[PDB]
C-alpha cells in the first residue's frame, strides 16, 4: 500500500507547525495523519496509538513535534520499528537551547533531526523515494523548481 | 512509616553519581533503592518498576538520573503520585547545555531540579523533614556541621 | 495544622509572577502567604520574617522569587529547616543566563529549582502529598485533568 | 540490488569517525563505501564521485561527515536524488557551536542530522527497513538487544 | 584597470544587506555587480558566474552574503584566485550562532569575515588601496570624515 | 593605613585569594584574609564585617565566591564603602558563573574584576585618589609593565 | 570637589550616559559628559584625558562604549586613578559584547558595573572612603532603598 | 617595491601564533616583520612603530594578534591607511567568547577577521595577488597542492 506519514505532536499548541509539514507532504502526494499525544502526560495514549499505526502493512514514517524539552521524539523512536524524524517547533527561549533535547540522544535512539518543517516533509519524501519512483519524480520536480526560482531571481538582476 | 528514596538512573554508567546520592542519604538515615531503567529504550520496564514502588505504603521520593537529553525525569514525574527530584549527571558537552532538557518542562510536570548529588539527598531529607522529626533532627545536625566547618576554617587561618 | 507555603519575592516588581504561583496553590487548597524582602538590602527584615514563619508548628514550604542574580533562594534555604523551592521570574537577558545563579549552589544549600510558576505550585503540593491524602487527591484530579485535555484534543483534531 | 551507504568525509582526519559508522553498518549487513572529498577545495572531484554513485540502480543513502563549518552535507544533499544523513565529527571548539552549520539548512536542503555515529548507521538501516524485511529483522534484534542489556544491568542491582 | 567588486548573495531575501554594501562602494567610486546564487541548490550556476568574472582582466574582490549556515563564502573562496570577503546578513536566531559557519573555515579557505556591510565595503576599498591611489585618497577622506563627526559631536554637547 | 579585607566563601578559594594578597603587598597595602559563606554562615560574616566597619581607616573589601556568587552582593549591601568582586575562575557551563557576579539589582554596586592582580591594582588605584604614596606605587608598577613590553619588542624585533 | 568624567564612544550612548549623570547629581557629585572613540579619534581622547589628568582634585572616569569595548581599557591604561566601565545594554549575540569589557589583561583594571545607577553609586562609594559628605549621601540613598522594600512588604503583605 | 606584512602582537606570549603566520608567509615568498606592542599599555610605542611602517612606499598589510579582549586590531586599523587582518590567538575561555571582541567593530573600523594563522597568511597573499602575478602563481600552486592531497587521500583510502 501507499506510504504513510504520521505527524505526532505533544500539544495542540504545535498544530501550526504540524500543518506546515502536512501541507508540504500533500504537495508530494504523500498521505499523512495528524495526532496529538504527550510522552510524559499521556504515555499510554501514545503507546496505544503507535501500536495501531505499527500494525499497518505499509511503509511508514513518524514525524514527532514537541516543544520545550523534547522527550516525544525519543519515546516514539524507541517504540516503532522504522525510521522517525524529529521536527521541533521553533523557540527562542534560552537562545534556542531547547534544540539540545532533540540532538542529544543515547546510542540506540536515532530520530532524524530537521529544523524546517518543509525540510521534514522533503526528507520524508526522499526517504520513500529510495523505493517509490512516483515520489522520486515528485522530489525531482520540487527540487528543480527551487533551483530554477533562484536562477530566475538572479536573471531579474543580471 | 519510614521514608524511601528510589534512585533511578538511565544507565549503569551513571552509577558513580547515584552512589554519591545514596551515600549521603545513608548519613541522614534514609533508606534508598538504586535501580536502572531508560525512558526511551525500556519504558515498560520502568513503568513496571514504578508500579511496584508506588504500591508501598510509605512516604517516598524518586531521584531521577539521566545524562544527555533527560527524558527520564519527566517520564517518572508524569507517572508517580508524589514529588520527584531530577539530578542529572555532570556533563561539559556543549558547555553543559544538556541541563536545558531537565529545566524545560511543560506545565504539569514538576520535578525538582538540583545539580549536586549531595544536595539532591539534602533536598530529599528536607522534604521528609516537614513531617519526620527524626530526619529534621538529622538535617539540623548536618547543616549546623557544615556551617561550623567554614567558621573553623576561618579561625584556622595564618 | 494544615500546610502553609510562604511565597517570598525580592521585589514588588515580581508580584505578577508570585500571583501565578498563589493562584495555582489556591486550586490545590493550600494556604499561602505572599511577602517581599531582599537578601542584600533588607537581610534583617528577611531574617525577622523567616523567624516568625519558622516558629509555626505546621508543614511549610518557602517558594523564593528573585530576578537577576538570585541570592534570595540560597539565603532563605540556608536559614530555614525544611525544604524550599526557587522559582525565578523569566528573563531573556543574556539568553536567559540568570538561571545559572539559581542552579549553582554550594554543597549544603538545596533549593528545588522549577521554572514555571504553575509547576512550583504543583511541586509544593506533591511534597505535602507524601503525607497529606487530601492534597494527594487534589494532585491526582489535577494531573488527570491535564492528561484528559490532551486526549480530548486528539479526539477532536485528529486527521 | 542490495542497499548501499556511501560514507563521504571531507578529510582523512575524519576517518576514525567514519569507521565507527562503517563498523556499525556491517553489523546490519549493509554494504558501504568510504570516500574522501571536500566541498570547497575539491568540488569537482566530489561531483564526479556523486555522479558515479547516483548512476547505480540500487537504493542508496549518503552519510556526510565534515568538521568545522559543515558545507559538505548540504552540497551533497542538494545534488543527489534520495535522502542523506549528516553525521559531523564531535568538537568542543566554541563549546560545540560547529553543530549549527549542520542544523541551519535553507528550505529545500534536507539532510537528516544525527550526532552519534552508531545512530547514523541505525537511522540508515531503519530507512531501508521500510522496504527491506531482512534489514528490518536486523534492526529488531539490535534494538531488542540494547533494551535487554539495560534490564540485565538493573537485574544485577535489583 | 579599475577595480570590481562582485556582491554575490545566496538569496533575493539578502538584497537589503547587499544594497548597503553597494551604496557604500559607490561612495568610494568602486564599480560593483550584484548577483544571486545559492551554493547548495544552484552550484553550477554559481560556478558559471564565477568563471565569467574570473576572466575579466581587472582587479577584483568577491563579497559573499549567505544567511543561516553559510556555505557560499567558502565555496566561492575555494574557486576564485584572489581574495574574498564574507559578510553574512544579521541574524538573532540561536543568539547569532550562524556566525560560526562563517568563522570556522578549514586550512586553505581564507575569506575575510566582516560583520557590518559598510565595513565590508571599507575593507574592500582598503584592499584595492594598496595599489590604487585614487581609492586610497577616497578612503582617507572617508575615515577622516568619520573621525571629525565624532569630535564635532563632542563639541556640540551642552 | 588603608586596609583591604579579602573575604572568600570557601577555603578552596585560598590560592585565588593569595594571588590578590601577594599583589597588594607589592603595593605596600595591608590586607586581611578571611573565610565566610553568605548562605551557610551569614551571622559569622556580619559579625566579621562589623568588626571591620568600625575601624577608622580607609578600607575596601575584595570578595571571592565561586559558583553562584551571593557573597559579593551581601557584603556590598552591608558595608558603607566600595567593594570589589573577584570570583575564582571556572569552566563550568562555559564560565556562566560570571553572570551571578554581573547581574546586580540597582543599589548593589560591587566593582567586578576577573584577574586577581587586577583586583589588587583597582584597590590600589581607588586609594590612590587620596593617597600619594600608593599613587606613586601604582605609577611605578604600571610603568614597569609598559617598559617590559617595549623591551620585549626591542629583543624579539624581527 | 570630586569630579566624574563620563566618556562615551558615540553620541548614540547619550541616554545611557545621562542615566549615570542624573544619579551622580543626586549624590551631589559634579560630572562632565564627553564623546570620543578609542579607534577613530584616539588623539582627541588623549588630549581630553590630559586636560582632566592635570586637575588637582579627586577624579574618576566612567567609560561607555558599545560593541567591542576598547574605550575602557584605553582610558584605564592612560589615567592614573581608578576607572569604571559601564557599557550600554545590547542583545546582540545574547549580550556577548560584555566579554570585551570583562577580559582585560593583567595591568588594566577598570571596574565593571552593568547598571548605570550602580556606576554612579560605585563612584560615590569610592569617594566616600575619604569624603564624609558623599558618605552621608550614600548612607541616606542606600537606607531609602531598603525602607522602600520594607514598606512594599507592609503594604502588599498577604 | 615588494609587499610587506607587519605581524604585530600585543604580547610576547603570542609569539608561537605569530610564528605560524610568518612561516606560512615565507612559503608564499612574502617579506614579514614581527613586532610586539600593546594598545592600552604602550600606545605611543605602537603609534611610533606604525608611523615608521606607514611611511614605506610599498604595498603592506598588518596582521594583528591580541588575546583576551582584542583592542589592538581596531587601534591599528583606525590608524593605518590600508587594510588589516585580525588573527587572534585561540582561547577556550568562556567557550571562545573572546572572539566577539574581534568581530564587533564600529562602522568605519574594518579589520578582516580570520581564525587560523595559515589562513591569515593565505588571505594576505591573496590580497596582494589582485595586483601581483608572482604571488598569484604561488597562491595557485598552494591551493592546487591542498586539493591534490585530498584527492590523493581518497585514491589511497577509498573502500
Curated annotation (Swiss-Prot), chains A, B, D, E:
Family, similarity comment: Belongs to the AIR carboxylase family. Class II subfamily.
Function of the molecule: Catalyzes the reversible conversion of 5-aminoimidazole ribonucleotide (AIR) and CO(2) to 4-carboxy-5-aminoimidazole ribonucleotide (CAIR). Does not accept N5-carboxyaminoimidazole ribonucleotide (N5-CAIR) as a substrate.
Superkingdom of origin: Bacteria
Molecular function as annotated in GO: phosphoribosylaminoimidazole carboxylase activity
Protein name: Phosphoribosylaminoimidazole carboxylase
Cystine pairings recorded for this chain: none
Any GO BP annotation: 'de novo' IMP biosynthetic process
Matching InterPro entries: PurE_classII, PurE_dom, PurE_prokaryotes
UniProt source species: Treponema denticola (strain ATCC 35405 / DSM 14222 / CIP 103919 / JCM 8153 / KCTC 15104)
First-level EC class: lyase
UniProt keywords, alphabetically: Lyase, Purine biosynthesis
Residues noted as binding substrate in the record, renumbered to the chain: 11, 14, 38, 41, 67, 69
Record annotation: effect of changing residue 40 to N: Lack of activity
SUPFAM superfamilies: N5-CAIR mutase (phosphoribosylaminoimidazole carboxylase, PurE)
Reaction it catalyzes: 5-amino-1-(5-phospho-D-ribosyl)imidazole-4-carboxylate + H(+) = 5-amino-1-(5-phospho-beta-D-ribosyl)imidazole + CO2
Pathway annotation from the record: Purine metabolism; IMP biosynthesis via de novo pathway; 5-amino-1-(5-phospho-D-ribosyl)imidazole-4-carboxylate from 5-amino-1-(5-phospho-D-ribosyl)imidazole (carboxylase route): step 1/1
Coiled coil: none
EC number(s) stated in the UniProt entry for this protein: 4.1.1.21
Amino acid at each position: 500500500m501507499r506510504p504513510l506519514v504520521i505527524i505526532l505532536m505533544g500539544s495542540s499548541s504545535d498544530m501550526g507547525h504540524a500543518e506546515k509539514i502536512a501541507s508540504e507532504l500533500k504537495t508530494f502526494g504523500i498521505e499523512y495523519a495528524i495526532r496529538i499525544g504527550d510522552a510524559h502526560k499521556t504515555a499510554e495514549h501514545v503507546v496505544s496509538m503507535l501500536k495501531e499505526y505499527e500494525a499497518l502493512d505499509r511503509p511508514k514514517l513518524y514525524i514527532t513535534i514537541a516543544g520545550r524539552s523534547n522527550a516525544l521524539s525519543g519515546f516514539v523512536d524507541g517504540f516503532v520499528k522504522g525510521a522517525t524524524i524529529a521536527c521541533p517547533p521553533p523557540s527562542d527561549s534560552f537562545a534556542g537551547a531547547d534544540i539540545y533535547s532533540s540532538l542529544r540522544m543515547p546510542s540506540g535512539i536515532s530520530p532524524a533531526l530537521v529544523l524546517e518543517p518543509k525540510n521534514a516533509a522533503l526528507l520524508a519524501a526522499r526517504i520513500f523515494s529510495l523505493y517509490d519512483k512516483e515520489i522520486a519524480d515528485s522530489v525531482k520536480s520540487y527540487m528543480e523548481s527551487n533551483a530554477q526560482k533562484i536562477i530566475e531571481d538572479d536573471s531579474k538582476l543580471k
